[PDB]
Amino acid sequence: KVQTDPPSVPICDLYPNGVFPKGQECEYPPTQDGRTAAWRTTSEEKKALDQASEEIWNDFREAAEAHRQVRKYVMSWIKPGMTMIEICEKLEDCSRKLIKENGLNAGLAFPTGCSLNNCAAHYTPNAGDTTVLQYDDICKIDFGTHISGRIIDCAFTVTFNPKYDTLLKAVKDATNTGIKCAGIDVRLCDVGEAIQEVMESYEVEIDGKTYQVKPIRNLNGHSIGQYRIHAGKTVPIIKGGEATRMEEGEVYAIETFGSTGKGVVHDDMECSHYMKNFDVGHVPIRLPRTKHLLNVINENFGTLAFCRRWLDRLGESKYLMALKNLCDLGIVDPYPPLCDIKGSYTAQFEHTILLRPTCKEVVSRGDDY
């Protein structure tokens, strides 16, 4: 009923009734016309629809509470000197325990991102990576949890040198701006316009040089689907366009990335992140090793993202060629680290929000961010 100092009690056991704490509930933003959205707070019609998907909102909540408790724990011990592997393994051990991992019914939604400095995302150490976190590093901790495929995609930035403070505030404010702007019938391009305007209102000084924070233009938020981290819609970060509005019942990951570099990322470094193409159907395979690896992926990850370290812990070895085969066949997709220019600094903040009938819920919101 009470969590232990180092988190070890499953969230499922801290709430016997199976009813988990809601996230931040917000009234939908008014339209340019000035039209309020308070009517949804209690409009029999919407209220009915909302309660209908209560078990689904509840699954997200259990995953969100696990996410909050895991990250609070991480923020207490993450320090320079630790290897990136020690960090991810210490975090994932806790995550698996609080989410009470159970195959595809409960577990880690994707690999623990711990991208450093100019690298903004998709970096998690592979076996043998001797990288050590440094005092001047700016690390993006991006991890996910899920219950029955209801995914919580939430992230924050870690630093130890106060010189990055305004950069972090800039991105945090940008993400919160995106969250505030989001809502039913809201145009995706407007959300991006709003995010950029706030992000660029920040100027920062790091080691004697000044910069106007830039959103990383080729990175963005996205809608979320069951077992599908990227459901199909993208949430800009800058003046964009897309081609659609947000819809009732949808779930979104609102994330922004800020940089002191070019504000554009490119593939770099060894790949660690991989994810089966959601749209690829069953594909017969005779090649022994390739066939086995695909079965391992289908059994343990399904359409969720995974990493090499997660294959290692399952006792798999000498699987690289088989993995490359699956990628070359288009069955699996590689997601290498995305980095801006050398010497640049990037930051990120992310939350998962639920566009419920009666309101907008920043389900992953915590006392930290």
Ligand SMILES: CCSCC[C@@H](N)[C@H](O)C(=O)N[C@@H](C)c1cccc2ccccc12
């Ligand atoms: C590589 C699968 S883990 C999902 C990564 C996720 N945790 C991250 O926060 C976000 O979700 N990053 C964005 C930039 C992204 C990565 C890969 C494909 C995308 C496709 C559409 C929209 C955003 C995408």
Ligand SMILES: [Mn+2]
């Ligand atoms: Mn993320």
Ligand SMILES: [Mn+2]
């Ligand atoms: Mn995301």
